[PDB]
Structure formats: C-alpha cells, structure tokens
Amino acid sequence: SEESQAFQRQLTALIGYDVTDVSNVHDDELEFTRRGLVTPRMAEVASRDPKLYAMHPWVTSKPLPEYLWKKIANNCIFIVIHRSTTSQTIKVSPDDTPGAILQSFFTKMASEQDFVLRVCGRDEYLVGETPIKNFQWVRHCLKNGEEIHVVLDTPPDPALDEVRKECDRKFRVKIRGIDIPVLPRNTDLTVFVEANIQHGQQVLCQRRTSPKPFTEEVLWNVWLEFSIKIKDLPKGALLNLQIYCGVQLLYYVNLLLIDHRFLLRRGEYVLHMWQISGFNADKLTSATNPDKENSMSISILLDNMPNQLRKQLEAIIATDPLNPLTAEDKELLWHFRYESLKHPKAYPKLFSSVKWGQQEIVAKTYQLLARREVWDQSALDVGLTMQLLDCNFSDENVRAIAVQKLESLEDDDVLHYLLQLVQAVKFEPYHDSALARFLLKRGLRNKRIGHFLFWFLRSEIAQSRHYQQRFAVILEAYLRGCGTAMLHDFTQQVQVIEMLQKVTLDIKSLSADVSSQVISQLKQKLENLQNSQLPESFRVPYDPGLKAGALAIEKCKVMASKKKPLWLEFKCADPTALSNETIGIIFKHGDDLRQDMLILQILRIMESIWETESLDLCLLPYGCISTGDKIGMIEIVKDATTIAKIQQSTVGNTGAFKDEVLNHWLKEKSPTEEKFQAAVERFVYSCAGYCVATFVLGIGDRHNDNIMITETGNLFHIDFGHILGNNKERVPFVLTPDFLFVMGTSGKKTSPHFQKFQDICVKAYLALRHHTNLLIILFSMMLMTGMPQLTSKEDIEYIRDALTVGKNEEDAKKYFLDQIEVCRDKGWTVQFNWFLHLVL
Ligand SMILES: Oc1cccc(-c2nc(N3CCOCC3)nc3c2CCN3c2ccc3[nH]cnc3c2)c1
C-alpha cells in the first residue's frame, strides 16, 4: 500500500502533473471527477476482449477506393509470409479473412496450437473477422505501390496488459476588492471590475463597479445586484469577473455559479486570475492561476405553417455555422422549434436561439430534447456533432446529444478526430462530461487511440495552466486502465524524450551557424546518452506500431535552422524488419508544435474527405507530437529536400531559379524514365493537394525553404508555426514557375500534364466544398484552442470566403482557377521578397 503510493508517483511523472496536489482548488470537483470516472474505467476495461485488445487490429469498414482497386489485377493479392530464414508467398482474394488463411498454410499449403500473423518490423497485426482489404496496413502497402510482408508467430499475452487491482431574489455578488503584490504599471490609471453572468459565450447580464484609483490593493465592499433571478440560473452558467482599466482588459477569472452537485455556490472566494498578453478557449476556464505569488486576486462573497416562413426558416437552416442569426431569425427558430426539430442541420442554430437565462424556456428546451427521435435516427454528421461541442454550447443535455452521435463512429474515425475532440474538452463547463468519458472508453477500448490520447492530453498538460488540472484527471483516469504493458511503454517513451529534450536545450545555448566542437560536442552527449541510460528500445510517439532502439550516432546532427533542432536517426529495434534504413526524428525547442499538430491533422481529415470521392492527392502529413513547452518531435520523411536548397545546387546563394532545375534534380534521381513518370505523376498530384489544402486553410503564401519534395516526386509543406499572422504584394498560395516547367509550361502555355493539375485541383476544391460545414467547425475550433493571438472572428471569416460559401459549383471553379493565375501572373515576385525578408 506504500507500494501503491510509490506507483501513484509513477502515474504522476508520466502525466507531468500531480492530481492529488490540492494547492490550486476551492472545491472538490477535480477529486469528485477522479472518483466519478472510476466507473467508466472499470466498465470499458471489463467489456473489452483482451485478445483483440492486445493485438489492436487496425481496421476500417469503408469502401476500398476507386483509386486503389485499379492497383489489383485478377482480384487476387500477394502476402509474403516469413519465418526464421524461411518465406512463402500466397495468392489471396481481397476478402480472405485472417482466418481464411489459418487453413491455407497449416493445412492447405503445408494437437497443433494457435499462432497468428504480424507485419514485419511493426507491432501491427492481422487478426479478427475483417476482410483483408479492411486492414489499414494492407491499404497502405497497396496505395504506396508497396508489397505486404508478415511474420507468422506467437500472439502477445493478454496477461501482459493486465490492469492492476483496486428563491426569487435577484442574484447578488459582493466585490470586496483586488490585490497584486507588485503593480508593474507606472502610469497610474483607474480600474473597475466587471461581473458578467455568462452561458456559452452569451452574456446574460453585466454589472461593473465604479472606477477607482489603481493601487496594489483596491477595496469596494459593494453588492452588485443582477436582474437575473437565481431560479433562472442555468447549470453551467459562469460568473466571469474581469478587470478593466482606463480602456483595456487586463485580468479575468471565472467561477461556475452552479457546482458539480447542482448546488448554488455559497461562500467567500479569493480567486487568482490570469493576465492578458499584449475568442480563445483559455478565456473560459474554471481553473484559477496556480501562481499565487505573482497573480492578481479578486475577493468576492456569495450569500443566498405558411410558405414564406417555412422558406425563411429553411433559408436560415441552410446557412453556414458562422452565419450570425439575427433576433428575427432566433425568434422564428424558437417559435417554430417543433418543425426545426425535424431537421438535424438546424440543431445548432435552434439551440443557439434559446434564452438560456430563463428557467421555463430551458424547461421547454429540455422537453424538446426528449423528442429527438429524428435526431437519434439521422446518420452521423461529424460537422454537426462537432458544432454542438464548441464554445457556443454549454448545456450538458445539448452537449450530450452530440456525444451520442460520436458513439456510432468506428475507431478509424475516432483517430481522425481525436485531436479536436480532446481540444473540445476545453469547452466543457465541468471536469466530468460525456465527452471526457467518451474519450476515456475509446481510449481504453483500443490501444491505438489509447496511445495517442495519452500524448494529446500530455501535450496540453505541459503547456497550459488554464487546463492542466482537468486534462490531468482524465489522463490519470486513462492510465489506471490502459494496463501494465502500455504503462511500461509510456514510461519508456517519457524517458527517452526527457533524456533528449535535455540534450536539445544545452545545444541551443552554445550557438547564435555550426561549430566544429558543437557537432562533436553533440556527438559526445549522444554518445554519453547511449552509453548506459537509454532504453533498449522505445515506441515512436507518432508511429506507435514502430519501435526504435540504437542511435545511429554518426548520422545525427544539429540542423542549420533558425532555432537549433536535432536531426536524429535511430536503428529499428525489430529484427524481423525489412531493412537497415533508420528512423529519423527531428527534435525542436523554439516553436509551438501544437499548431503544427492541429494543421497536420486537419490535413489527414482532408485526405479522407477525398477518399469518399476516390480522389487521392498524395499528401505527406508527417508525424509531429508536441511533448512539452515550445518543444516536441517531428517525423523525417526519408529522401526529401526543400525547394530552397534545390536552388543552391545549380544556382547558389541568391537568385531567381532556373525554371528547369527541379526536373533536372528529378531526372537526376529517377534511375529510369520508366520511374520518372511516377515522379512528375506524384508531384502534380501532391502539388495539387497542398495548393488546395493551403489556400483553404489560409497558409498557402509560404517561403520555399518551408516546402519539400521527395526523390520520388512527392511534394509537401512543413513547419506551420504562427504562419497565420495578419497590403504588400500577396500570392494566394505557392504555385511558382519551377513547379510549372515540371508540368511543361510558360506564362501562356497549357500541357497535357497541366490541364490535369488545372482539372484535379478544381475537383479537389469542390470535394472540400461538399463539407463546407465540417471544415468551418474544425477551423474555427483550431483558432480558439491552438493559435493564441487569433483573437478576432474576422480571422475565422477567412475560411468561408476561401470556401466561397453559398455559391454555385461553377462560379467557385472560376474563383479558384483565377487564384492559380495570380500565382502565374506573379512568378517569383513574392518569393524574391521573402529572400529579401529572410534577410531584411
Ligand atoms: O512541422 C514542422 C515544424 C518544425 C520543423 C519542421 C521541419 N521538418 C522537416 N522535415 C519533416 C519531414 O521530413 C522532412 C524533414 N525539415 C525541416 C523542418 C524545419 C527545418 N527543416 C529543414 C530545413 C532545411 C532543410 N534542408 C534540408 N533539410 C531541411 C530541413 C516541420
């Protein structure tokens, strides 16, 4: 039992936070939340079949795309089984279950026990009752023109990931005063306090204090009387106290007026507040600043139908999420709420039209909710679901119908949206929520989700004071059920990257290009690191199937980059592997990688969209995990080099590029013209996607040292640090002459390979528009929870313009096709400027 409090200190150092340390509380919610979560932990743990859990087959139920059938002939597929030296090679119909070849070997291909299949190099299996074309690896092996390879061998023990044993008065708030140990500001202003009663961003009522002289301490002793009545207070309503000084918002804090037990909140409070750098999901947190020594305090006290209408209505429900409802709109929605209830696409706007500070309306709402059979019968729409989980919605019951829909989703989709679901917790009123528990079950039900959940949650715990307590209670909850096997890996992973962050920082300090000492100085630390203290092997945090062991010391180097990042390379710890070729991770302090994760994941989202219309655009949305404060890792795509550096090779230090160089570099890397096609093939496709992807996301305009290509023609962008920073010469995105001559064209021409691009984009762009709503919610959500300095809605209204909302298919492609021209009619103009900016 003191061995039980030894392991709680394990739990702690994995999390990077102490979920017992009641330093920064003023109620029992976090604990109550620890307690509250034990049930769903134990439930899902129990429900889970430990065999399939231990092997976590990674499977989809989606159609095999119309782009990926055409890589098969005669509806059979090769699967090269291996053993100690031995190796056979079976034909297979793309429906053969893993079980449909337990007999095509131990019997047909030539008492006995049971042993099952595993991909070569990876902790990645082919088990359970799924077609063979429904395993994600196979589809990849196919997609990339690769060929399967697996190892017959013993299943992993289900005993390994064992889990350990176990009133009609108006509301009144007294403002006593505010206190700061030092008042940094030297111009003596005045300041007042603004008490806002709030619900999901709607202010319900607002009362200020009388301005006073600003001093290190200011007392008012005043009751502020609100017009709202207590009866009318809705669970989740937030008391938002804010310090203004004249005008400017310097400090905010929040207190859930109704506690996690539905109790009105009675008492004396001293609340430590957050300052305001220079909406945002941080403005919403029930967390108080844990830095009591520097933070400002406040001190408070609480004692206690026609045509045109149906038309009008439908024209409202047919707008985007970002379209702002007028009062007329709202009253119309509310009055016709029962008709509105028939269309699930109206749910967001409908519930946005509820007067939430009015007890009897909420009632009527809550009964309107009890008649959503139509909702309950609709096919899941992630966009819509998502949209009810955002900052605009703060009622449990509503928020719960959303989480209801997410329950349908198969694991392959949870993975797709996991990052943004995790961030969506930043908008939950309460630490315990349907969303948090839904993340939990799924976390525990499937090891893959489980892995990434850990890192997602841990990422935020490391660089958010506004949310580390809450995410920590959920992380702890996860770990208490993931099992000993994963506990193990997790602690292993944490060691490596801690071990390695150490190394990255020291190296920055030594530098402000490269030293002779610094390369061998690094070399010396990396030799010392391997010398004793590193794990025999660790799971690659962004590719969990893939264990890594020894450090190819000779190949690791400090990059000649802006900050000083470590190019590392690693030997694979898995003998059965298909190669000697290493695993390449970049480590980096200096940027916020949380922004890169977000954008990368959106990119994956954009792939899958295209999968629905059997498009494929060969993006490389590479691995990237934020792991701590301005510090995380990135996956190295092997064989790649940035455009900028393909410019130094032929042409050097500065200057406009030989529009041909790229293709020489290409033909230089194609061994056969019988491959080279595959290069400019890949390129024109890959070029297509990142152009669409970027303009849409508002990050197309980029220097070409931030744009890469593979020696097999695949092009991709990198480093998305604060590139969204808001009229000099501007280019919608990066389509430059070099990219063009590779197509085979000049400022007028039109190739058989260009028309293609000109065509294949427009296809890709309108494909995106079939999900206008989904992209808008994700992008909105991205700005509020990952890009600080994205204060304005003006920021958000980019995407709708970008996506040309409420417009005919055709006009759009004549919006888009022109965009490509601006880039044509610009060549290297803006690129040059970035050269004069990369030095200005
Ligand atoms: O998303 C991010 C965030 C921060 C840095 C990077 C980054 N990534 C990569 N990758 C990732 C995929 O494999 C190819 C190498 N290379 C990077 C960066 C930032 C700098 N950098 C870089 C810059 C110049 C180079 N010249 C030759 N290789 C280069 C790599 C990416």
Q: What is the CATH number of the domain that holds 181?
A: 2.60.40.150
- Asked if residue 179 and residue 147 are part of one domain, the reply reads no
Query: 596 lies in a domain?
Result: yes
Q: How far apart are CA 438 and CA 245, in angstroms?
A: 42
Q: How far apart are CA 446 and CA 392, in angstroms?
A: 31
DSSP secondary structure letters along 22-80 = GGG-SSSHHHHHHHHHHHHHHHHHHHS-HHHHHH---B--SPPPTTTGGG-BTTB--BE
The Å distance, Cα 719 to ligand 1 centre, comes to 7
- Written as one letter, the residue type at 698 is G
Instruction: Could you list the beta-strand ranges (E) of 695-814.
Output: 707-710, 715-717
- Asked if residue 632 and residue 508 are part of one domain, the reply reads yes
- Asked if residue 356 and residue 491 are part of one domain, the reply reads no
CB 178 within 8 A of CB 296: yes
- Asked if residue 814 and residue 711 are part of one domain, the reply reads yes
Residue 724 main-chain phi, psi, to 5 deg: -85, 80
Query: 143 lies in a domain?
Result: yes
Among 588, 730, 713, smallest CA distance to 646 is for 713
Query: 839 lies in a domain?
Result: no
In this structure, the chain runs to a length of: 840
3-state secondary structure of 831: helix
Per the structure, the count of domains in the chain is: 5
Q: Could you identify the residue written with the tokens 């690693």?
A: 570
Query: 840 lies in a domain?
Result: no
Q: How far apart are CA 364 and CA 379, in angstroms?
A: 26
Q: How far apart are CA 507 and CA 502, in angstroms?
A: 9
CA angle, 108 then 110 then 111, to 5°: 90
- Asked if residue 196 and residue 334 are part of one domain, the reply reads no
Q: What is the CATH number of the domain that holds 752?
A: 1.10.1070.11
- State which ligand 1 atom lies nearest to the alpha carbon of 637: 13
The Å distance, Cα 686 to ligand 1 centre, comes to 17
- Asked if residue 517 and residue 465 are part of one domain, the reply reads no
Query: 837 lies in a domain?
Result: no
Alpha helical stretches, state H, 532-628: 593-611
Q: What is the CATH number of the domain that holds 40?
A: 3.10.20.90
Residue that terminates a domain, selected from 612, 638, 664 = 638
- Asked if residue 40 and residue 21 are part of one domain, the reply reads yes
- Asked if residue 203 and residue 131 are part of one domain, the reply reads no
Residue that terminates a domain, selected from 288, 304, 320 = 304
The Å distance, Cα 718 to ligand 1 centre, comes to 6
Beta partners for residue 79, in sequence order: 90
Q: How far apart are CA 357 and CA 237, in angstroms?
A: 9
**Non-local CB neighbours of 448 within 8 Å, separated by 6+ positions:** 56, 58, 411, 415, 544
Instruction: Name the residue with the closest Cα to ligand 1, atom 5.
Output: 719
Q: How far apart are CA 114 and CA 155, in angstroms?
A: 8
Q: How far apart are CA 607 and CA 716, in angstroms?
A: 13
**Non-local CB neighbours of 182 within 8 Å, separated by 6+ positions:** 216
Number of other residues whose CB lies within 10 A of the CB of residue 348? 24
The Å distance, Cα 556 to ligand 1 centre, comes to 14
Number of alpha carbons in the 13 Å side-chain half-sphere of residue 155: 19
Query: 765 lies in a domain?
Result: yes
Q: How far apart are CA 679 and CA 665, in angstroms?
A: 11
Query: 838 lies in a domain?
Result: no
**Non-local CB neighbours of 662 within 8 Å, separated by 6+ positions:** 643, 646, 709, 738, 739, 741, 742
- Asked if residue 623 and residue 663 are part of one domain, the reply reads no
Q: Give how far Cα 376 sits from Cα of 326, 368, 369, Å.
A: 28, 13, 11
Q: How far apart are CA 538 and CA 570, in angstroms?
A: 10
The Å distance, Cα 568 to ligand 1 centre, comes to 12
- Candidate of 504, 556, 557, 559 to mutate for ligand 1, largest count of ligand atoms within 8 Å of Cβ: 559
- Residue 338, classified by CB atoms within 10 Å of its CB into exposed (0-12), middle (13-18) or buried (19+), is exposed
Annotated binding site for ATP: 584-593, 619-627, 716-724
- Asked if residue 631 and residue 490 are part of one domain, the reply reads yes
Q: How far apart are CA 840 and CA 570, in angstroms?
A: 38
Residue that terminates a domain, selected from 483, 499, 526 = 483
Identify how the structure was determined.
X-ray
Q: What is the CATH number of the domain that holds 395?
A: 1.25.40.70
Instruction: Name the residue with the closest Cα to ligand 1, atom 31.
Output: 719
CB 348 within 8 A of CB 388: yes
Q: How far apart are CA 464 and CA 485, in angstroms?
A: 29
- Written as one letter, the residue type at 739 is F
Q: How far apart are CA 799 and CA 819, in angstroms?
A: 15
Helix pair angle (772-786, 593-611), 10° resolution: 170
Q: Which helix (H) or strand (E) covers residue 450, if one does?
A: helix 447-463
Reading the block at residue 400, the tokens are: 């719960």
Instruction: Name the residue with the closest Cα to ligand 1, atom 12.
Output: 636
Instruction: Could you list the beta-strand ranges (E) of 83-148.
Output: 116-119, 125-126
CB 105 within 8 A of CB 80: no
- Asked if residue 182 and residue 162 are part of one domain, the reply reads no
- Asked if residue 183 and residue 149 are part of one domain, the reply reads no
Reading the block at residue 254, the tokens are: 């929040």
DSSP secondary structure letters along 653-699 = SS----TTHHHHHHHHH-S-HHHHHHHHHHHHHHHHHHHHHHHHHT-
Instruction: Name the residue with the closest Cα to ligand 1, atom 19.
Output: 719
Q: What is the CATH number of the domain that holds 626?
A: 3.30.1010.10
Number of alpha carbons in the 13 Å side-chain half-sphere of residue 136: 13
Instruction: Please report the resolution in angstroms.
Output: 2.8
Number of alpha carbons in the 13 Å side-chain half-sphere of residue 816: 31
Q: Which domain holds residue 292?
A: 167-304
Query: 198 lies in a domain?
Result: yes
* Ligand 1 binding site (Cβ under 6 Å of any ligand atom): 561, 586, 588, 591, 596, 622, 624, 634-637, 640-642, 645, 705, 708, 718-720
- Candidate of 559, 585, 586, 604 to mutate for ligand 1, largest count of ligand atoms within 8 Å of Cβ: 586
